[PDB]
């Protein structure tokens, strides 16, 4: 009677809540991962993400072998294959860590129900969050739609520490392997076999080992300057751990512990502040994940009533130029180029290009949300939807109407155009002054396009549409 542990976005053996809980029940612990066609074949899957995922799985296969058992690989529909696998193995139970997204939660409910019908226990525990969505509630027992109060609560809650890595596992026998032979893939498919290609690199190399190494390195040095270095795209001031957190190559308790230890080690007020600021970013992460959990309709698009009626202009040609980094706005194009070429973008840049697509181009932001999901190595529904709702204050933590001025943003966060010239080398000959203002002479512009829109006119247009709608309602 073995216990199966179903991995999804927790591709590591260390600090894994459900895995550690399973090990406490049995040493005959076998891991499994199911390549779900509804996920892998989605038009919203990003090649960079498949590449990172695949790399994480290669290491996980090794970790299980070294631990004493193995990682089973399946390809097909979870609610059909997992119960069948469990039944063929006469599994005592199937464990996994809970999801916050609509698809995963619906899927899990079905798998759990199928397992129950088969008389097999299903244990679903919280792992990817320091505090589950049901632990953080207002005085009236309700979820938060405003960040301030959420943080006040979240910050005061006792923090959990990392759990133990399972050891001394017992592998499946030949007879057990024969019983499940039909449900398994003989080996982990290569990226190319899956029909994907990616050669743009990663913010952090794939796998548990690389993630843990990055966390330690960051907390050992860079984290001390996080504030204000986190604001400048030209600087490598952030952790680059986003895909590791999205796929769980690193445990959230490990991340919190490393930062906490660095804070206790530091004797500098500035360093301590920088570390606290990084820790709060983890809080923002939970704010958006808890929001998606409590208000799943957020995934459908503009949340607030007014925004569900916004008269998006939707000029496809403008959207296309945005996707191809041909907007004529240096700060925006450099950012879009970084995204398509490397699958990652500095947060200040995500804010900048999002504001541009939504406010300047006036394109339904779901188009941008989707493009980001089709290219981000860290593409995450909760954080991505949170970022795009943010571009219009159409969801959680709404703020008064505001429109970023690309030139103002560039001058403030890329004052010497170092980031711009880095991703737009064909403009390295241009003075930072003009790259920031976005006013480049045709001769020095070469093949670089002219601005696709006039910011002042677009800003007036967006405000006019907003004010007219607000009045009509």
Ligand X SMILES: Cc1cc2nc3c(=O)[nH]c(=O)nc-3n(C[C@H](O)[C@@H](O)[C@@H](O)COP(=O)(O)OP(=O)(O)OC[C@H]3O[C@@H](n4cnc5c(N)ncnc54)[C@H](O)[C@@H]3O)c2cc1C
Residue 175 CB contacts under 8 Å (≥ 6 apart), including other chains: none
**Residue for token pair 């711009």:** 420
Clarify whether 388 is annotated catalytic: yes
Whole-angstrom distance, CA of residue 376 vs CA of residue 109: 28
- Strands lying side by side in the sheet with 29-35: 71-75, 29-35, 3-7, 93-97, 121-125
Angle at 25 (CA atoms; ends 69, 115), nearest 5 degrees: 85
Shortest distance (Å) from residue 422 CB to ligand X: 17
Q: Which of 312, 313, 341, 405 is catalytic?
A: 312
Nearer to ligand X, 28 or 374 (CB): 374
**Residue for token pair 């399972």:** 166
Q: Which of 126, 151, 256, 284 is catalytic?
A: 284
CA 470: distance to chain centroid?
33
Shortest distance (Å) from residue 115 CB to ligand X: 31
Whole-angstrom distance, CA of residue 327 vs CA of residue 450: 7
What is the number of the residue whose Cβ is closest to ligand X? 387
CB 256 within 8 A of CB 263: no
Shortest distance (Å) from residue 204 CB to ligand X: 8
SS3 143: coil
Q: Tell me which residues touch ligand X (CB under 6 A).
A: 230, 238-242, 245-246, 281-282, 284-285, 288, 347, 350-351, 354, 372, 376, 378-380, 383-384, 386-388, 390
Clarify whether 347 is annotated catalytic: yes
> Residue 471: CA atoms inside 13 Å, Cβ hemisphere, count?
6
Clarify whether 454 is annotated catalytic: no
Q: Which of 278, 388, 390, 423 is catalytic?
A: 388
Clarify whether 281 is annotated catalytic: yes
Q: What are phi and psi of 93, to 5 degrees?
A: -170, 165
Shortest distance (Å) from residue 190 CB to ligand X: 25
Shortest distance (Å) from residue 342 CB to ligand X: 12
Clarify whether 365 is annotated catalytic: yes
Nearer to ligand X, 89 or 250 (CB): 250
Q: Is 429 exposed, middle or buried (0-12, 13-18, 19+ CB in 10 A)?
A: exposed
Nearer to ligand X, 166 or 379 (CB): 379
Shortest distance (Å) from residue 77 CB to ligand X: 26
Q: Which of 281, 313, 341, 405 is catalytic?
A: 281
Tell me the helices (H) and strands (E) count for the chain, helix number first.
Answer: 22, 5
Rg of the chain on CA atoms, in Å: 24
Nearer to ligand X, 108 or 369 (CB): 369
Shortest distance (Å) from residue 390 CB to ligand X: 6
Nearer to ligand X, 94 or 258 (CB): 258
* Largest distance between two CA atoms of the chain: 74
Residue 75 CB contacts under 8 Å (≥ 6 apart), including other chains: 34, 35, 37, 185, 189
Nearer to ligand X, 18 or 386 (CB): 386
Nearer to ligand X, 86 or 262 (CB): 262
**Residue for token pair 């208000």:** 295
Whole-angstrom distance, CA of residue 180 vs CA of residue 265: 51
Q: Which of 344, 365, 390, 423 is catalytic?
A: 365
Shortest distance (Å) from residue 449 CB to ligand X: 23
Q: Give the 3-state secondary structure percentages of the chain, helix then strand then coil, rounded to 5.
A: 55, 5, 40
Nearer to ligand X, 111 or 335 (CB): 335
Clarify whether 284 is annotated catalytic: yes
**How do strand 29-35 and strand 71-75 relate by DSSP bridges?**
parallel
For the annotated catalytic residues, the residue numbers are 281, 284, 312, 347, 365, 388
């Amino acid at each position: 009677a073995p216990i199966l542990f179903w991995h999804r976005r927790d591709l590591r053996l260390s600090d894994n809540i459900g895995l550690a809980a399973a090990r406490a029940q049995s040493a005959q612990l076998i891991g499994l991962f199911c390549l779900d066609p509804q996920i892998l074949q989605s038009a919203d899957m990003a090649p960079a993400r498949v590449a990172y995922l695949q790399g994480c799985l290669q290491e996980l296969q090794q970790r299980y072998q070294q631990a004493g058992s193995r990682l089973l690989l399946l390809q097909g529909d979870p609610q059909h294959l997992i119960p069948q696998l469990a039944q063929q193995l006469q599994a005592e139970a199937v464990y996994w860590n809970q999801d916050i997204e609509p698809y995963g939660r619906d899927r899990d409910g079905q798998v759990a129900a199928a397992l129950k019908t088969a008389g097999i226990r299903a244990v679903q525990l919280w792992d990817q969050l320091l505090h589950s969505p049901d632990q953080i509630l207002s005085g009236s027992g309700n979820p938060y739609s405003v960040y301030g109060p959420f943080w006040k609560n979240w910050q005061a809650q006792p923090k959990p520490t990392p759990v133990a890595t399972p050891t001394e596992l017992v592998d499946l026998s030949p007879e057990q392997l024969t019983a499940i032979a039909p449900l398994l893939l003989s080996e982990l498919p290569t990226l190319k076999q899956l029909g994907f290609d990616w050669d743009g690199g990663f913010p952090v190399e794939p796998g548990e080992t690389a993630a843990i190494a990055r966390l330690q390195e960051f907390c050992d040095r860079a984290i001390a300057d996080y504030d204000p270095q986190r604001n400048f795209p030209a600087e490598a001031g952030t952790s680059g751990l986003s895909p590791a957190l999205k796929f769980g190559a690193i445990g959230i308790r490990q991340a919190w512990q490393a930062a906490s230890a660095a804070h206790a080690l530091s004797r500098s007020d500035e360093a301590r502040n920088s570390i606290r600021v990084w820790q709060q970013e983890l809080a923002w992460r939970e704010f958006y994940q808890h929001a998606l959990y409590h208000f799943p309709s957020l995934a459908d698009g503009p949340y607030r009533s007014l925004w569900q009626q916004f008269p998006w202009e939707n000029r496809e040609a403008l959207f296309t130029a945005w996707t191809q980094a041909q907007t004529g706005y240096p700060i925006v194009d450099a950012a879009m180029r970084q995204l398509t070429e490397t699958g990652w973008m500095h947060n200040r840049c995500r804010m900048i290009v999002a504001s541009f697509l939504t406010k300047d181009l006036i394109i339904d932001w779901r188009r941008g949300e989707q493009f980001f999901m089709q290219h981000l190595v860290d593409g995450d529904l909760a954080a991505n939807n949170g970022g795009w709702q943010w571009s219009a204050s159409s969801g959680m933590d709404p703020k008064p109407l505001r429109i970023f001025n690309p030139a103002s943003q560039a001058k403030k966060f890329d004052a010497t155009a170092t980031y711009i010239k880095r991703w737009l080398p064909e403009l390295r000959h241009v003075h930072p002054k003009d790259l920031i203002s976005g006013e480049i002479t045709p001769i020095e512009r070469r093949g670089y396009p002219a601005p696709i829109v006039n910011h002042n006119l677009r800003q007036k247009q967006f405000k006019a549409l907003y004010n007219q709608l607000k009045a009509a309602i």
